Ligand binder design. Structure first.
Ligand code: SF4
Ligand SMILES: [Zn+2]
Lengths: 49, 80, 49, 74, 49
DNA sequence: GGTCAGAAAATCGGTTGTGGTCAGCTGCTGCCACCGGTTAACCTC
DNA sequence: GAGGTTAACCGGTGGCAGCAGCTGACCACAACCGATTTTCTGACC
């Protein structure tokens, strides 16, 4: 889930609107993800309830 | 010590580039004569012809907004 | 204190150093040109090396 | 990275009005380009004057005297 | 592919093959350089033997 | 044998204008994915 | 001996991409004119 474990491309939100480095740390209400690097898939934790 | 290509031989980029856009017909005459020693005046002149330059010295030749000039008239009344 | 070294190995070993030096001697004006010159093994690389 | 630095140097070799015109035209300062009349509005002249300045500046950049350092960056 | 009898050296092309890489997004700086130089978009990627 | 004055450049800058072209927007056009009802196939009350 | 059952097949929905027609933003260019400003020439006599 990209909404939990970050995006899959560098500063690429999921719908595709925000694709610029001027956007940074901005969660996108349409797709759900926060714009950042794809390196955060190395160290973003999730939990099961 | 360089052993590079003919870029210092290339008299386009020897000095100041703004000289090549001189706002004085005399002031660009040195620029136009400087490409008399240019190895590549044919292809450069051809490229400037086909790309429809708006300005400047090109192939050892100035260009108007559309095409080739003999040489620009200066400010004032043209003579007889 | 000395040891030998074959040139086809040492050229591969010292490749970024020789890239920097033969850019600084203007034998190749950019890094990609330096890399292609090293790959084609033009004779100036030994006197640089 | 060296391309970005060389681009900054050559962009700063020309004067500030056309420099900021190119920067706003291509988003080299923010990541977002502007319309021609938007740049004309934020500078102070009409968009056609802006277009003339832009075209002649693009030709000046296209000239080999400034394209020497960017001839083979592709 | 090369002709029969053509003497080769290190790293030369033996088979010329180029792959359809699709189209990716463009950096504005690459856009400016492509506008300056006037070249093909080069929508395919080379993988040559 | 000086002397304003006019004509005519160019040069930066508006202007108009207009024409087109394309980004996109969006209601039809039509096809495409679940959902389940039914219809001829298996085991012997 | 069809009763009851059964995998698959056979109507019947909502989703989505297309998609062609319709805006308006926005540029191309094109002239085109408009102050500016030199500056040369042109009669006065
Ligand atoms: S304008 Fe003339 S001198 Fe300058 S680079 Fe082109 S051909 Fe050479
Ligand atoms: Zn999104």
């Amino acid at each position: 889930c990209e909404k939990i474990f970050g995006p899959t491309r560098d500063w690429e939100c999921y719908c595709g609107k925000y694709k610029r480095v001027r956007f940074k740390g901005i969660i996108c209400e349409r797709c759900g993800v926060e714009v950042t690097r794809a390196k955060v898939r190395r160290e973003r934790m999730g939990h099961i309830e | 010590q360089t052993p590079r290509q003919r870029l210092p031989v290339l008299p386009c980029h020897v000095g100041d580039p703004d000289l090549w856009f001189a706002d004085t017909p005399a002031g660009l005459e040195v620029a136009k004569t400087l490409c008399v020693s240019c190895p590549i005046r044919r292809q450069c002149l051809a490229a400037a012809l086909q790309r429809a330059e708006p300005w400047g010295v090109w192939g050892g030749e100035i260009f108007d907004q559309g095409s080739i000039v003999s040489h620009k008239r200066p400010r004032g009344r043209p003579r007889k | 204190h000395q040891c030998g070294l074959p040139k086809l190995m040492a050229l591969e070993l010292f490749k970024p150093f020789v890239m920097k030096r033969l850019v600084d001697l203007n034998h190749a004006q950019n890094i990609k040109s330096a890399k292609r010159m090293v790959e084609r093994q033009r004779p100036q690389v030994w006197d640089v090396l | 990275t060296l391309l970005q630095d060389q681009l900054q140097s050559v962009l700063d070799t020309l004067s500030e009005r056309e420099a900021g015109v190119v920067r706003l035209r291509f988003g080299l300062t923010d990541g977002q380009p502007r319309t021609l009349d938007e740049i004309g509005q934020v500078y102070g002249v009409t968009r056609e004057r802006i277009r003339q300045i832009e075209s002649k500046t693009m030709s000046k950049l296209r000239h080999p005297s400034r394209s020497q350092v960017l001839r083979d960056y592709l | 592919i090369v002709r029969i009898g053509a003497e080769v050296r290190d790293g030369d092309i033996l088979v010329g093959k180029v792959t359809p890489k699709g189209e990716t997004e463009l950096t504005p700086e690459e856009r400016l350089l492509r506008a300056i130089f006037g070249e093909k978009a080069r929508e395919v990627r080379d993988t040559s033997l």
